[PDB]
Amino acid sequence: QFTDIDKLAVSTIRILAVDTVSKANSGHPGAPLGMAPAAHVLWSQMRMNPTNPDWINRDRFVLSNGHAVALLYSMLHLTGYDLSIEDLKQFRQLGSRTPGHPEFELPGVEVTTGPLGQGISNAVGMAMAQANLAATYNKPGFTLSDNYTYVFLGDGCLQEGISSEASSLAGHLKLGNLIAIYDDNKITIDGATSISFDEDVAKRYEAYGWEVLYVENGNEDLAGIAKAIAQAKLSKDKPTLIKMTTTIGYGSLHAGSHSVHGAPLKADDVKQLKSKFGFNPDKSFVVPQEVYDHYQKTILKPGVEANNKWNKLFSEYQKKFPELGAELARRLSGQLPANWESKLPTYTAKDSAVATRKLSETVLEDVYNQLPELIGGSADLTPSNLTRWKEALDFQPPSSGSGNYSGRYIRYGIREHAMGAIMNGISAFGANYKPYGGTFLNFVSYAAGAVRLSALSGHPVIWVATHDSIGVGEDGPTHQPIETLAHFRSLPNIQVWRPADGNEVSAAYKNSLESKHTPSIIALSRQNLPQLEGSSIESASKGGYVLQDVANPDIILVATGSEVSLSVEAAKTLAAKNIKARVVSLPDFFTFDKQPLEYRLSVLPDNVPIMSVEVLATTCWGKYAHQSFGIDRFGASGKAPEVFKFFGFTPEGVAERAQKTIAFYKGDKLISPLKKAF
Amino acid sequence: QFTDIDKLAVSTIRILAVDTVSKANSGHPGAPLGMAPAAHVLWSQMRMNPTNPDWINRDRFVLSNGHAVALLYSMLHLTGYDLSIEDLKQFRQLGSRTPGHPEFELPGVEVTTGPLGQGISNAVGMAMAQANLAATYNKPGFTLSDNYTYVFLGDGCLQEGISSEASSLAGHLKLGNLIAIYDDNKITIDGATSISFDEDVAKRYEAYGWEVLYVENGNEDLAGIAKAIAQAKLSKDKPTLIKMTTTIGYGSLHAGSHSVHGAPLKADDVKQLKSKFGFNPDKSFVVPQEVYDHYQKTILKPGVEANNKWNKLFSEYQKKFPELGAELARRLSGQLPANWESKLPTYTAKDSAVATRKLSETVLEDVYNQLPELIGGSADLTPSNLTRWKEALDFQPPSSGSGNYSGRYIRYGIREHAMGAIMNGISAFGANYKPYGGTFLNFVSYAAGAVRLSALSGHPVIWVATHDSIGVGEDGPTHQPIETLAHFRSLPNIQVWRPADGNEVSAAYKNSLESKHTPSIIALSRQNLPQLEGSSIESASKGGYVLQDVANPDIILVATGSEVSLSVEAAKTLAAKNIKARVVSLPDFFTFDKQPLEYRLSVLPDNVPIMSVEVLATTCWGKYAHQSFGIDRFGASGKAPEVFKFFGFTPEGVAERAQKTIAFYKGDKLISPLKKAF
Ligand SMILES: Cc1ccc(C[n+]2csc(CCOP(=O)(O)OP(=O)([O-])O)c2C)c(N)n1
């Protein structure tokens, strides 16, 4: 039952955001001015502790339409999160805590958004993650998980394919606790939606299996908005979209125009806004005491009280079910089981050749029993990626009869970009969820919006990217990565492992799974690769190490993945013509660059020509070698030995090229490429 | 009305496509078998000439589920295209005309497909270019343009978000002549569709404004399928989707399973299939002469007659409408207007500072009327990207009141991947279509599935990517490109132009528009750059040039875009304390790499340290530079000059690093990075 204070709360949210943008002299005022009533009605009714933004059973809210940040920054300040008027008075400025689009790093901001389509897709991970937790640990008497995931979205997020991929899957899985509120404002940047987007959203979403409710006066009807949220909460086995119509820039002297989407309202427009809302035209960043006190009784103090009850029931649970309690307690502290690493496989050069892909499968076989928080899947490639262990149970709705929500194998369908973002949402949930998803390395490029954000936020998701080159063969150039790794190695904060054998696969799994702030790509072979004499988890964990040494070498050859063996063989050949060649295995650029310089310079020393061997683009290699043998053109369709042969990657093709490199440089002094001037 | 020969032709396609997979012992047999009837029936009513596969008014066929290619090669053979049983007998083998997934470059293959969701979105572009040709050239009595676009597709294509962006825009544009038949086989790789895809496709499609017809028996109802395509051709204002149900692998002992998705059938199963259809189990690649006779009659001879009447008519047309007939003949021979290049703007250093973004807009305004084949557009950032000339009309249904199909400016919505595949479809249509699309440089990444195929197939599409660096400012890290250029510079066959001033934006445009086979990305500044002294179109068209030279440079500074003015200022600092810098402006890696080595070595010689200056990733720069100053971490939200200073990119901060580069190398002899050893 909304009184005049609820109407005072809504004008302070709108004008605070107006103020924020106008001081910054930059930012988007329009959606904050129209979404403010929905923010007030929703937040007031979400169960959350502002003093503990990390309580696992907190309701989660994602602002998918990240450009509306000043609405999230006002709410965060007013409902009592650590963020202040001074923070806000520095919206969009160098160094401040208030950047131009929300970032995971701030408290009460759940994932970073700004790229459209990302927030709504992350929220689907969050709801899958709650569905899984609740299923795993809730016991009759102890309902430790039952929260909701509220999403805010625009027309933009409904146009991007990722949210149609995500929504299709959310609908399949029956994710009842996911509630999206669509700001139907009939405007985006170029103008009116009818110029390019006139589909029937509601019918589109009901087709997916979502329930759709409507609110027609979202600009003033707090009860309407209120009853929709409440009806949505009864939708136990359908996600809900609430389509709430609003006017962009409500109150503004140019509301409904598209000029109010991303520029500060002008001075005189803001003053009439203050007068009309009963605020003073010449005062800014003003919060009535009545608003703090309101949210203090409405949210902060029940939230703390709710958080506090949770703690006591969790402790009776650790008494009642000591080992499940022990498990959840660990995940919540964010440590992995002690000494889990002992279940990782090791091999010698005595055991068989095996594609790095079937070795990948053996890690998953050996570790899932040890790490309950490891939840995996595939974007329809399960038998190609070898990404599901034998005793698994699929994550499905219980009605399906194929699996249930305790299951740990997500079937993603042909939805890469969606799986990238759903993986980020499962990881941003907490309780130590280790998400992975497989596909073919060539199609991880589809997911690139989502993967740049696993890197910007630091979400340790794992991509199991199999079929990593022309050794795919006959599927041809549409399915053969050329530029893929080079790309992702130019992206700050992401591990790109390309293992050469069994020990190096175990080191890629170990470092990826132990990571707390870097995502990983494990690039894996379709084809059989031999076990190497002298690979080791320990050594490959440094990301780059001398695999085969000689005294006073003529050349250093550096290879990644399937080219390490080819380089060892070319190394025998160079030896018989009396050339000493050192073979270096660089499984991950990132991890090796995290090494201390004096390590790096023992692996890639001065005064020795250094040549790289890798069947993908040579563009990222100048930082480790002097001359590079790689492929800077698309591949080809044929038997895989023949495509390798057709491009030169043969032991005598590498040896020839090492010889031409020794010859080119005899007499010159050579500096290591690692060394920089400044 | 179909007869016995129509059923013999359908068995001949079934078994010929099976013998092609089994021969390769690699491939996908299932969708060939189940889809053979719709192929027979659809192709028999297409108007096409096997003899002339480039006839502008041919009905166009796209197979979007590209893995089903054994079938597209069976029909191209059978209907008289240049492909023999021999070519069929080296399917998937190194260097044959039969790749494991179709490539644009083959006669009768329209676009490269195989990546899911790419076919359908390209077919939307091809229907947009048809509608634009028809409204621009069709006259009373002269219907030079009226073809249909047909697309085969499957479950995989429907789950990729790019076909949902594409279908939405298509429904908005009311593209009546685009007819999609979907293989509703209830199987994908992982198993049944219900394990993760059980949305109501039909209701979803009606939501976009598409008409949906249903063929309950695709397996044998020739009459029904024909009815459906006939009905489909009546609706001029709805694109049509035919949900046709089939059994994957019809006629196989394991028909209806995911086993027959991508494995050659078992020999014993191939034998029974052949007996089952009246063929000899012991013979291969058998084609009844009645089948050959049948298609020569129903498809090739009609086809050749249609092409001949079309020609007669186009000759009358150029008598009746000279200009228009000369223009369409020019566009049809692929030539640009003569001397179009002279309408491009030149500037001197006495001209004013302008962002290269505004300067792009003035090229577009100065050449759109010279080039009627130029069709522009943005993905909802028209006022940011500055992509629209003034007098433009938008490409809309006539029914809209906002344009008609003679419009040349498209409002793509917030659909970037789909803009990508659609500009590839427009280019692939012919008539010298020159599509260009605007977005933010950081979000071209959203469209990587399509940008890769632009380069593999060689469709010379232009992306106008404004807002290239931390000069974007206050929106910060989510919107500032870090790795984007080093990604597309590692892609074979794409210009990535990053012009520093007007004369370089003109050169970028000239080189991109003359291109017949290589796409282009032009990265542009949000912020004001000045007009350099030393640029010119001629120099800038070589891709790397010496902007200012000195006799005997102590250092060469290689820079691109907003950093070339910075480097010319750093060079003024250095001069003052008598270091001689040569400043090299490198606007495109591709075009420069294409120069004669003699030219490149006169730009980047031996025996001088070369330091590169660019505010994005340094990884790619090892090929031209000894030391590189750039950003290998994400950005910051702040006013742009402040963010540049934070990162060190000031005149004196560049000068300073040049000084440490000189001092690091003094007394080493240096070899230009361009010199390769093999
Ligand atoms: C992936 C992507 C592309 C381009 C943009 C730029 N952009 C920001 S909002 C928007 C569309 C505005 O529509 P909206 O969600 O309906 O916003 P509103 O507040 O209603 O005006 C665009 C294109 C981006 N942030 N993310």
Ligand SMILES: Cc1ccc(C[n+]2csc(CCOP(=O)(O)OP(=O)([O-])O)c2C)c(N)n1
């Ligand atoms: C972007 C993308 C990712 C992954 C694949 C690999 N792939 C090809 S078909 C298929 C999905 C099952 O496809 P379908 O269209 O239902 O075909 P059918 O022949 O009906 O089984 C998979 C995952 C692809 N070609 N492109």
Ligand SMILES: [Ca+2]
């Ligand atoms: Ca909007």
Ligand SMILES: [Ca+2]
């Ligand atoms: Ca299928």
